[PDB]
Symmetry: D2
Subunit: 295 residues, 4 copies
């Protein structure tokens, strides 16, 4: 037998950083969960019990904190690239670093119509994420994403004209509820290294904001023919607005809300045009994915 | 042996309701999870296998949907009181109904600065809850609450002057992070029945809004001497603003963020006044509770 | 306003302890999650910012570890009583301690038919729990429980003869699936203090074992007329076997498995006597409770 | 823009099946969660709102139940292959089916030393899983796995001789706790189609049993030099025992248990050779992966 692939590191490293403006007194907080996995010439740790090749996962944890102390942690695409580059430059035998960052929301509170200098609220479990793969001699590959964005529209969704055969019971509909949890990923063109990532720093926050705005507006305004058709419209617009993105991937559950027939009870009308009370279904759920790229 | 207490019913009943304004085209959605447990002369179902006394839990589920179809579901204090009253009036041998409702957030989306007529976002897992106990001959007892409100302040929290003995290692501090998940419950004076609950309908939403506003403002503005002292200030203000509340209960975790000493690494300074990077602790956590009532 | 009730302490304290037999080489591990909340003359910490009355929650955490180092951690009823007693004896102004312990399973592995001296498996998320309330001048109240015991029987459950009215759609049945997660609590007679708890130490493990055995056997063998009737049989037997128990409480979800009518597809028969494939329902669920005591 | 990749289907489909032996009266239950995603000539559903190419996800759900009614559901490798093949054969324009199955444990109860005919317990959240990819013209690729197998050993784990530099604080150790949640996957050689999968049916259950047995024995008996070295030993043995496996992948968290220095309290000795009470750490955790194949 032989080692075909190996990676190891530290997962679930929670990090908080505060920035204090001494002039204004305003404080800004960042909180992340970080994972770093390394690859390289480490096979002998597995095959021969040779620990000399192992950068301890505990040391990887220390490095994450030290790097956060000495560098900006925002945008996460930059922080991830700094962190990954560190490992491939410091250790001759490490040739790839894989950095995953989940950013948690701490939104500044408004008190009496004014932004508070040092108080924050977690407004939703929506996350902003990055996956950064730093590979020696091959540059830096960055996938940016938003996830956990949960939305619902109560009308202006349709689903008719699908294949009907002996396995089909679903009725066609011209008016239904559509609800989903949005997972959207945009993949950047390969960057040659840290200098190039630094040169594009302003684009990271702007593209995240654009992706979020396009997702929300398209969901709200599209008279949806299907989840498939609506998600494609979203992806098309993001690619049109940022030339440095190569692909956009959406993964969307279809979280079903079922009509409840109450006619058995005193002829009560609660279906079709009379539907007011519905039963949200926890499972099963549709799952629709697509990756959109350039012509 | 004898049955000392018994209750049974249906838990985890998910309900969605839509209201459609035909004039404006504006739609408003409500989504809840409901639990209903009944008590009464039902001992024989346990002791003698006498099912004749059992209103099937499946029927309780049907009743929740029918009641939602025929009545407003907001404020939840009203809906819960209607639902509980139904069971004690319909069934001679049922003498108490216990209704728990969790309300999920569906906040109307703003698209291009305008409120959208039929599109909604889940902005946080904060819940608004009610517990309604309807007891035949003893009226209606309502506890209203908010939960899952997660906040953090990065300064203006202190903790010094506590008891020090041979079990104590904690250092006194004049500047720390304070973060918590707020669970706040206000208990209404007993209501004589549904007519009285109806008479106070406007107070329910207003008191929830007040409780939330007082919680946020006090947290943000108090130069906190302890979680204990800050929570008491919150409770005092709520009781002052709504005479129909008898008690306010807060239950607050103290979610710790620890300093990280980096001095071992090239003399790096990251403690006390130089603290920038912290380690959020998943566990253990302080847990502080208090119930405040009137003199 | 006035403080009506207050308690505070440390939650989610994870503790592991190993016992090493030097003679045999056999090692035995225990792992728990502990919560300790205190009450007493502490109102001034809330009302006047007087921290002098506060035993820091951090110190409570230290105390849990020190107490585990110096005492047996099994049975948990004993450990909880030692821990609670410590606080009321050490601190003049603390008058009640509330200790909750969750015990996690680490079951010794069998390798090649022999018990391994130092290797363990988590066989299920079933827990053994204790709640110990130590109140100065009023002794020690102990509630012991098992929870997270998940079982299913595929036949020998019935449910017919229930109330039928205009809210009822449920069909009577003489053969159904019954599945539940068992939560069972036995409450001990009040103990005068630690000496009395020590005197009954062998009864704690034996009663837990009896409660588990009675639950499993009764579930498996009863031709169940309802969840209500089966749970009562369980409780009756436990009370008969341990005179020092005052009450037994069961709380049982009814986790539904629905028939799937496939007749629309080529006349396929999958209901009643022909039912083979079912759809487990995540929600809603029946919830049935009862507390059984002595005549 | 263009669709680069697309797949869609139904996730989280819970299925239960019972087998009844009429001769012996013995019943056997199976419970799974199933996901099926399809690929093929479906781009126009995304780009042109052409639903005619869509097999509704609701119909996919129906198909899972019908297929379970008409076929064995065990071993899951066979059921998954039947299910996937169905879609590529039935629908001309569907060219790949991806089937994921999670099998839940229902272990027959022993009552008074005898196996019960129709009563079952969930002994742990350990799962047996399959991923089956059925691709038209390219056969059937099956990855089998076990996950959620949680183990701990209290001694006979070491970790010394790792790289030490200015980022390192971890002390070398010759005796530590090792605990992990095992995720192990074995990938079968490509099968030409359903006939070939059928021909190997007995190997599926036997290989799962072997993988589990090798994992447990190696964990228990290895005087572990590192997680890396121990996991490699496991993988090597599985590959030696089943020639139809091409690769074995392990993914193992290192769930840390930290010593607690109690020396500050009355010189209490609880480190190194005197360590008895430890603090389990919820996060962060080491994460170690490896894929082992043939020379
Ligand atoms: O077994 C281990 N492997 C590792 O790579 C490691 N790093 N820190 N501790 C460790 N333990
Ligand atoms: O065992 C049961 N008890 C009940 O109260 C009930 N209600 N519906 N089905 C039921 N099954
Ligand atoms: O606000 C606090 N209250 C307490 O009781 C406590 N104990 N440790 N830290 C603390 N912080
Ligand atoms: O938008 C939808 N897309 C689908 O593929 C589907 N299948 N059933 N319902 C559906 N809704
Ligand atoms: Na390198
Ligand atoms: Na009544
Ligand atoms: Na005392
Ligand atoms: Na095909
Ligand atoms: Xe969508
Ligand atoms: Xe607080
Ligand atoms: Xe039961
Ligand atoms: Xe391991």
């Amino acid at each position: 037998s032989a080692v075909k692939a190996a990676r190891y590191g530290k997962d679930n490293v929670r990090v908080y950083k505060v920035h204090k403006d001494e002039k204004t007194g305003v404080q800004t907080v960042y909180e992340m969960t970080v994972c770093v996995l390394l690859e390289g010439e480490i096979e002998t740790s597995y095959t021969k019990a040779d620990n000399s090749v192992i950068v301890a996962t505990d040391s990887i944890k220390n490095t994450i904190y030290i790097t956060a102390k000495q560098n900006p942690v925002t945008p996460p695409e930059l922080f991830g690239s700094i962190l990954g580059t560190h490992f491939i430059e410091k250790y001759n035998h490490i040739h790839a670093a894989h950095v995953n960052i989940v950013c948690h929301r701490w939104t500044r509170m408004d008190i009496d119509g004014k932004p508070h200098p040092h108080s924050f609220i977690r407004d939703s479990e929506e996350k902003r994420n990055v996956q950064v793969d730093v590979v020696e001699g091959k540059g830096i590959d960055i996938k940016s994403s938003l996830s956990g964005l949960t939305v619902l529209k109560s009308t202006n969704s349709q689903f008719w004209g699908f294949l009907r055969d002996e396995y089909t019971t679903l009725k066609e509909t011209w008016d239904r509820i559509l609800s989903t949890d949005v997972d959207a990923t945009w993949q950047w063109k390969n960057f040659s290294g840290l200098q190039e990532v630094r040169s594009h720093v302003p684009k990271f926050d702007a593209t995240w904001a654009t992706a979020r705005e396009v997702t929300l507006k398209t969901f709200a305004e599209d008279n949806s023919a299907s989840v498939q058709a609506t998600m494609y419209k979203m992806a098309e617009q993001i690619l049109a607005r940022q030339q440095l993105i190569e692909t956009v991937e959406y993964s969307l559950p279809n979280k079903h809300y079922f009509e409840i027939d109450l006619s058995w009870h005193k002829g009560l009308q609660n279906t079709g045009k009379n539907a007011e009370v519905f039963a949200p279904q926890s499972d099963p759920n549709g799952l629709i994915k697509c990756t959109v790229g350039r012509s």
